[PDB]
Amino acid sequence: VQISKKRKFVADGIFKAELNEFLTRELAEDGYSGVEVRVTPTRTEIIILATRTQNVLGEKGRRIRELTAVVQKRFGFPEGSVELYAEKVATRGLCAIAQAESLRYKLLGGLAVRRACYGVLRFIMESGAKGCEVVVSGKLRGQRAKSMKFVDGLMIHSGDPVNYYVDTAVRHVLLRQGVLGIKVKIMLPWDPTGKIGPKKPLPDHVSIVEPKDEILPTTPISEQK
Amino acid sequence: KKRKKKSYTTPKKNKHKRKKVKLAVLKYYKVDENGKISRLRRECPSDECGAGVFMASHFDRHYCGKCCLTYCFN
């Protein structure tokens, strides 16, 4: 099947988005974080990064089998040409998807909203984040809809660096009285190499290398062996 | 919020159930009490269906149901 490069790339993006949404709503209870797709000669792998992999694979790899079967049967992959894996994410506290899901399940599971949100915030900051912000909007009891916002640390809002320095996620919690929106933003710490955060530093931060130490007395007398 | 506003006319309508006669006379009729019932005119010998194709007669232009078959001399 021949298809233009623009259409091919757009269809690849559509496939990534649809797959992400499907397995998000499928295994968000299992701490789903993200999906990556590697297309290589005869090898099309789908890596599912999730906090807990015990139920992502299930028992004897049943759930991984069902996921592979449904993905292949829906997207028309050749039989056995797609194998989807599942690996843990090292830093769960720096992903807004995982932490918004965690706050949702702490709110649904029974907890004071201020307590659950402050626990999430505390976990974000001991995970190493430079700052975080959780805003909970909706029915906070009563007819009117309130919105609370707990911001602890530092976070930028404007400019380009928000794209690679602030990671945000929005989730809907279905309560008996209505829908509650939870928005979590985490500002990643600067990290050269290792891919836990962003590589390039904040563009307004100018770092200075310390000039070499110089401790010499009035008369140069060196210590030699 | 707005429909076609078709409610002033026909407030209530009786059911369109037909009281078709149970005893078939147009379709099947014997009045001979014999196993062999025939037609006084030559029957169409077409073999694309069974040998007992049932054809009824009216004043003119009968409607049969599949292709509106009509008794004709080709």
């Binding site: 649809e18 949404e21 499907f22 709503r25 499928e26 004897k60 089998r65 069902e66 079967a69 449904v70 049967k73 829906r74 028309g76 | -």
Partner: protein, 97 residues
């Protein structure tokens, strides 16, 4: 219900022979890309399996216009409670160790 019976029995047989599928959310559509060539017109077949899984006692998983059905123990239990056919006709679920 807008359903016949002959295609209904055929679709129960097909569902027995397959078990786990993914379907799109259409009703009157006889041209479904991934569920064609079953010796039967695709309208009745596809709606038929949608209704087979959507009676009110079997779950689903659906979004982006697509139904996802995995054979839980509820699927097999309703198989037993409704069709009363034991699984000794081995499904595609008893493999891949």
């Amino acid at each position: 219900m807008l359903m016949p019976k002959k295609n209904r029995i055929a679709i129960y047989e097909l569902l027995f022979k397959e078990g786990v599928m993914v379907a799109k959310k259409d009703v009157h559509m006889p041209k479904h890309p991934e569920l064609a060539d079953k010796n039967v017109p695709n309208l009745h077949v596809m709606k038929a399996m949608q209704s087979l899984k959507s009676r009110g006692y079997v779950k689903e998983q659906f979004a982006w216009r697509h139904f996802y059905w995995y054979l839980t123990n509820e699927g097999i239990q309703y198989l037993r409670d409704y069709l009363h056919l034991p699984p000794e006709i081995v499904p595609a679920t008893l493999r891949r160790s």
